[PDB]
Ligand binder design. Structure first.
Ligand SMILES: O=C(NCc1ccccn1)c1cc([C@@H]2CCNC[C@H]2COc2ccc3c(c2)OCO3)ccc1F
Ligand SMILES: [Mg+2]
Lengths: 339, 57, 613
């Protein structure tokens, strides 16, 4: 028939992929790094307890000045904080209460966000008035917006629960390009440093990779037993990490095109909600549902420490562009800055 | 679902035709970047209270 | 005492409360006294295009009450040649009447439906948006939270006395309106075994009490207490016709004509709402203090809209044949026979069938069943036709039982002189003005608590006219300054109150929480309900505290002393107890919290990032 040929010709390809994957699997990262020195016992202390949000925090993000951060809550707001002062530069009450994600434009000018509203909304902070306005309301998706990221002030990229991602012209306000492939809800996305490529991670238990200007997927990555809640680029634009519901994190490589490491423990039973790399790549920080955040050695996969401040679930996190700090938001309603 | 499989074969065709380096090498480029930029990574290298915006001022 | 309108933030909750019931339409708001007024205020002033149309509607409305033909002949021509005078065959219906020199009240009634058709849409959308609609919501909240006690009335003089209780005269404190109060005794009712009668009266009163009928003792409210039941009725301080007959002796034909004319329309009213009065007798007719009358004591009356009654209830003098016989059902027919017995007694001093001042109940019934109408020759021709008409033992022939009801009685030669528009208008002079200071003007001859559980009641049309006549325009002014001061206070300070606007707010407004679980200490706050959370703020700020839909496990009612509370059991097993300011806010918060917490927990389950596992 025509169906069975084009479903087995897929396995023939998936095998040809899985063979070329194993061909490249000469050693484990764990072996390659077995000898290099332990990071030590990384004990970070809570430095800023940022109170303000009134119920669960769900997402946050840092500006390019390495100081101003935007965050999103169950309480229905964006708070553009200044992490140094612990003070709020903008509180932007939102048109929709179900906010899940938020972003910050590289220029410092615009921010964006969304959630169960199925909209990515752009906010201009350079009005003549001297306040915040909504320049564009980018509509076109059909499921919950779960992540978004500006490339420049004319253009932006978005991921959603409808199982798609997309690039927008903000001037005309239309999707310049659209990105399909995924089969369960998309949860997170990460741009590259050059911003010609980006990556998505989903409840399908897989992650994917796209050329911005062509308009099509290049590479797809699996391994986890359960939902991938989080994704982040390795600093050089050639690998990325993941957080998952199966009680483990994982690293994947773009040119090698496969899984390098798994971060886990017999004591640890709960799931993972967020991942960020330190500026170099060496620490992988992850947030859990036993109320702690664990610092993993990215290369050795040892439990390097416990950020054990929060009294409920850790939900989001981020590392600065200058590497100075790690922010953790929780279900207990507080952000914390650590270093 | 005539197009659904025809897309998947076209797509996997794309995902196969890419020049793939290897895990020992990739692991070493990751390690090469880590080691290289490790100086300027505050979370590994305990930078003193002066250098840290979140310690004193 | 006086009525305190809640603040114009009540709009949010009440707009929803009434939208839940279907009541924010041109029809349901225009139809309400307090609604029409606010609508008109808007069109004449705060919209230019609407000016001509409402002016026309008002010039039409004024026109309908004009009493003589001459007035209508002039005001037809003035309305036709006026600056206002959009339609095609509206003009032709009126040009036909004008050409044939005719001018009824409903002359311009075709323009009523069509002016209403131009006032829905653009114009009514502009009203709902206007400040005038806000004010509507403020009044409607007061309505739905009425709980009365003895203490809400000023109880004056005893103006009635029966075997189960006593009637008292009174004023209602908050509007100053004057009223009567009937007060039945439960211990007595137990020994004398009359629990049904008490309960029956309550139902019947509520059937007749709308349409503002000049000719029945209507109810505005009902309530009860550990020993007493109580009704609040139209004030009739003038005594019953059993006392008055026994004072005045019998009445003239023309005097009885007045009483007849009014009672007839009183009956027209009960009959157009399918009630059989049953117990018509002098002791149940009652006079105001101009001497206009109303019917009363509905305890033996009956809804005949469904099943027509068969029991022999009434009083042995005044029962119709069909009532006295078991196995025979009856409708409003009983009233027209009773009217004859009662009108004949007004003219003669005893029931036609209570011959020879006998107590032999058995004899009295067989005279009602068998013998016929011994009418004196003194009675006029037009009167003789009437009582023969009313006292037919066979319903087929009884006047007002042939098809067109009360108008069969109105067209009688006996009422030929009357302009029945002038009658309904109370514009004809009454025959007996009752004297000031009269004792015994309405006397008669002489576990369990569960039965009266649901007794309390209130009538909207009555409470609304009560207000409109009285305190309305002055309260609206008092409130409009109070509001406009605080909007100047918000504008000049540079601080608008718009935390609800431009978001996804469901409903906001005040309630009171207990936040000291050992202590019992209550605190009032402004709540914003959003789809996922119940935020709350205090005085002059954005909200600092909340409760999530997620965390709520059940929403019950609990009693603490005499506080009706909402008991949210929260995860932990902790108890969050809330107290609303009014019944409708308790109903809406209990509804919207249940509906929000179930809707939230259902949706939160469908979102991986938000659920727990
Ligand atoms: O006992 C009374 N009525 C009979 C009854 C009622 C309920 C249940 C069982 N039985 C009763 C009767 C009267 C009088 C007895 C004589 N006829 C008039 C009647 C009603 O009196 C009124 C007197 C003044 C009124 C009024 C009614 O309405 C407005 O102002 C007064 C109080 C009474 F409690
Ligand atoms: Mg009968």
């Amino acid at each position: 028939s025509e169906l069975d040929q084009l479903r087995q010709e897929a396995e023939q390809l998936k095998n040809q992929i899985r063979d070329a994957r194993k061909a490249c699997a000469d050693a484990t990262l764990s072996q390659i790094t077995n000898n290099i020195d332990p990071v030590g016992r990384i004990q970070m202390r809570t430095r800023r307890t940022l109170r303000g949000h009134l119920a669960k925090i769900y997402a946050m993000h840092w500006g390019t000045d390495s100081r101003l951060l935007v965050s999103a809550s169950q309480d229905g707001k964006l708070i553009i904080w200044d992490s140094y002062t612990t003070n709020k530069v903008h509180a932007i009450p939102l048109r929709s209460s179900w906010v899940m994600t938020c972003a910050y434009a590289p220029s410092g000018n615009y921010v964006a966000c969304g959630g169960l509203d199925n909209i990515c909304s752009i906010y201009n902070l350079k009005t003549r008035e001297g306040n915040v306005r909504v320049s564009r309301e980018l509509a076109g998706h059909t499921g919950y917006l779960s992540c978004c990221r500006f490339l420049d002030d004319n253009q932006i990229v978005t991921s959603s629960g409808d199982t798609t991602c997309a690039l927008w012209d903000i001037e005309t306000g239309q999707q310049t390009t659209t990105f399909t492939g995924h089969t369960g809800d998309v949860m997170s996305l990460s741009l590259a440093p050059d911003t010609r490529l980006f990556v998505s991670g989903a409840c399908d238990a897989s992650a994917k990779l796209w050329d911005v200007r062509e308009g099509m997927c290049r590479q797809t990555f699996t391994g986890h037993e359960s939902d991938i809640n989080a994704i982040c680029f390795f600093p050089n634009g050639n690998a990325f990490a993941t957080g998952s519901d199966d009680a483990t994190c994982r690293l994947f490589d773009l040119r090698a095109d496969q899984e390098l490491m798994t971060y886990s423990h017999d004591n640890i039973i709960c799931g993972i909600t967020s991942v960020s790399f330190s500026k170099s790549g060496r620490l992988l920080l992850a947030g859990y549902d036993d109320f702690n955040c664990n610092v993993w050695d990215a290369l050795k996969a040892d439990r390097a420490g416990v950020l054990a401040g929060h009294d409920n679930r850790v939900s989001c996190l981020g590392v600065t562009d200058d590497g100075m700090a790690v922010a953790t938001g929780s279900w207990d309603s507080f952000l914390k800055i650590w270093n | 679902s005539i197009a659904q499989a025809r897309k998947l074969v076209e797509q996997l065709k794309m995902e196969a035709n890419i020049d793939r380096i290897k895990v020992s090498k990739a692991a070493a480029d990751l390690m090469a970047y880590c080691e290289a930029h490790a100086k300027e990574d505050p979370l590994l290298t305990p930078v003193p209270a002066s250098e840290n915006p979140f310690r004193e001022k | 005492k006086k009525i305190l309108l809640p603040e114009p933030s009540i709009r949010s909750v009440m707009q929803k409360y009434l939208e839940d019931r279907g009541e924010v339409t041109f029809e349901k708001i225009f139809s309400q006294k307090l609604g029409y007024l606010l609508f008109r205020d808007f069109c004449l002033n705060h919209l230019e295009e609407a000016r001509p149309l409402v002016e026309f509607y008002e010039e039409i409305k004024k026109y309908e009450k004009l009493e003589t033909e001459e007035e209508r002949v002039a005001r037809s021509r003035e309305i036709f040649d006026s600056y206002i005078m959009f339609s095609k065959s509206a003009t032709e219906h009126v040009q036909g009447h004008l050409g044939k020199k005719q001018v009824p009240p409903d002359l311009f009634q075709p323009y009523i439906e069509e002016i209403c058709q131009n006032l829905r849409g653009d114009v009514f959308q502009k009203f709902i948006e206007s400040d005038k609609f806000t004010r509507f919501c403020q009044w409607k909240n007061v309505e739905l939270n009425i709980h009365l006690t003895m203490n809400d009335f000023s109880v004056h003089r005893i103006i009635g006395r029966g075997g189960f209780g006593e009637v008292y005269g009174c004023r209602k404190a908050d509007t100053g309106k004057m009223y009567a109060m009937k007060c039945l005794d439960k211990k007595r009712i137990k020994m004398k075994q009359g629990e049904t009668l008490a309960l029956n009266e309550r139902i019947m009163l509520s059937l007749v009490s709308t349409g503002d009928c000049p000719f029945i003792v209507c109810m505005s409210y009902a309530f009860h207490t550990p020993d007493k039941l109580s009704f609040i009725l139209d004030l009739m301080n003038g005594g019953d016709l059993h006392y008055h007959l026994s004072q005045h002796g019998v009445f003239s034909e023309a005097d009885m004509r007045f009483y007849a004319a009014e009672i007839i329309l009183g009956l027209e009213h009960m009959h157009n709402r399918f009630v059989v009065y049953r117990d018509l007798k002098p002791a149940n007719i009652l006079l105001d203090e101009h001497g206009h009358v109303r019917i009363s004591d509905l305890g033996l009356a009956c809804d005949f809209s469904k099943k027509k009654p068969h029991a022999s209830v009434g009083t042995h003098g005044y029962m119709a044949p069909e009532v006295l016989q078991k196995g025979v059902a009856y409708d409003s027919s009983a009233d027209w026979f009773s009217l004859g017995c009662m009108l004949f007694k007004l003219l003669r001093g005893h029931s036609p069938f209570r011959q020879h001042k006998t107590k032999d109940k058995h004899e009295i019934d067989r005279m009602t069943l068998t013998m016929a109408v011994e009418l004196p020759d003194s009675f006029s021709p037009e009167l003789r036709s009437l009582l023969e008409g009313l006292l037919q033992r066979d319903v087929n022939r009884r006047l007002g039982c042939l098809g067109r009801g009360a108008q069969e009685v109105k067209e009688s030669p006996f009422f030929r002189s009357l302009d029945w528009q002038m009658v309904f208008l109370q514009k004809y002079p009454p025959p007996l003005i009752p004297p000031r200071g009269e004792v015994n003007a309405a006397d008669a001859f002489d576990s369990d608590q569960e039965l009266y559980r649901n007794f309390p009641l209130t009538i909207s049309e009555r409470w609304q006219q009560e207000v409109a006549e009285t305190v309305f325009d002055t309260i609206n002014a008092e409130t409009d300054r109070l509001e406009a001061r605080k909007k100047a206070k918000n504008k000049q300070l540079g601080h608008e109150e718009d935390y609800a606007l431009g978001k996804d707010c469901i409903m906001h407004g005040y309630m009171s929480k207990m936040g000291n679980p050992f202590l019992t200490q209550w605190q009032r706050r402004y709540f914003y309900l959003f789809p996922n959370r119940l935020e709350w703020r205090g005085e002059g700020e954005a909200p600092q505290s909340l409760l999530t839909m997620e965390e709520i496990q059940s929403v019950e009612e609990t009693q603490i002393k005499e506080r009706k509370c909402l008991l949210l059991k929260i995860r932990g097993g902790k108890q969050f107890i809330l107290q609303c300011d009014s019944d409708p806010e308790l109903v809406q918060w209990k509804k919207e919290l249940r509906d929000a917490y179930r809707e939230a927990q259902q949706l939160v389950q469908r979102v991986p990032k938000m659920k727990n596992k």
